[PDB]
């Protein structure tokens, strides 16, 4: 069991204050949302958490150390996976030989690189519980939306991370594709693995969140359960609208 535990972030932007405190848990196997107004504070905080915007205040701790002035790749390489919007998987790689090259780089806890017979074990394990195990030889380049969303899931677990941070994992996304991606959270929560998700759909959202943190004005509106949010009078009044209904 891992806790990522965020404390008072804050970021200024020339005189105008972004965030202005906030603070968040994410627990092992839990699945937490980031959801507020556009701009309100909710991404930029977000990015603090990946890594992609310096800290102007603030703590990060990852099982208790503190993260908050490392690189991404230093954050990744103690767990913390980013799963951006765009892309990347290599193209011109076959699905197979994207998930290899992640394994081909990685160290063990031994302190070694993983034998020949160890990547092709862990590839094949991954291509299986991702379900893509048909298109290993497939050209990234070839995959339909969703079969691409299974390889960069693949490619994020063969780092073994211990968190997942999703940036809007929903955005134009069909229904159906909806369903396919609340699926791969809950296999990610079933490894343990603690899920963050900033998005902008907020049904689809809460929908598969235990705990759910509302950014607004820089700061932690309110946070709990989908459930208790929904009935949040302030929260309504801000963000969801008197008469919202999931
Ligand atoms: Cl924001």
């Known amino acids: 069991s891992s806790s990522l535990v965020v404390r008072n ?3 200024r932007y020339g005189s105008r204050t972004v965030v202005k405190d906030v ?3 994410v627990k092992s196997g839990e699945v937490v949302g980031l959801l507020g107004p556009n701009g309100a504070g909710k991404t930029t905080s977000f990015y603090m958490i990946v890594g992609l915007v310096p800290l102007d205040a603030g703590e990060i701790d990852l099982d208790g150390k503190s993260i908050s002035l490392l690189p ?3 954050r990744a390489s103690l767990g913390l996976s980013y799963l951006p919007q765009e892309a ?10 994207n998930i290899r090259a992640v394994l081909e780089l990685q160290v063990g806890d031994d302190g070694k690189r993983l034998s020949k017979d ?3 074990s862990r590839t094949e394990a991954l291509l299986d519980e ?3 195990s048909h298109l290993r030889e497939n050209p990234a380049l070839s995959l339909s939306g969703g079969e691409r969303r299974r390889v960069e899931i693949a490619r994020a677990l063969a780092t073994n991370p211990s968190f997942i941070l999703l940036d809007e994992p929903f955005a134009g996304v069909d229904p159906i594709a ?4 609340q699926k791969i959270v809950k296999f990610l929560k079933q490894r343990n693995i603690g899920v963050l998700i900033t998005d902008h759909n907020v049904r689809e959202t809460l929908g598969i969140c235990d705990h759910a943190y509302i950014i607004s004005d820089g700061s932690v509106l309110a946070a709990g359960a989908p459930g208790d949010i929904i009935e949040n009078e302030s929260v309504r009044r801000v963000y969801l609208g008197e008469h919202f209904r999931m």
């Open 130 to 132: 991702l379900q893509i």
């Open 72 to 74: 991404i790749h230093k």
């Open 88 to 97: 990347s998987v290599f193209r011109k790689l076959s699905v197979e030989e």
């Open 9 to 11: 972030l804050k970021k």
């Open 23 to 25: 603070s968040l848990d």
């Open 118 to 120: 160890a990547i092709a």
């Open 178 to 181: 909806v369903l396919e991606i």
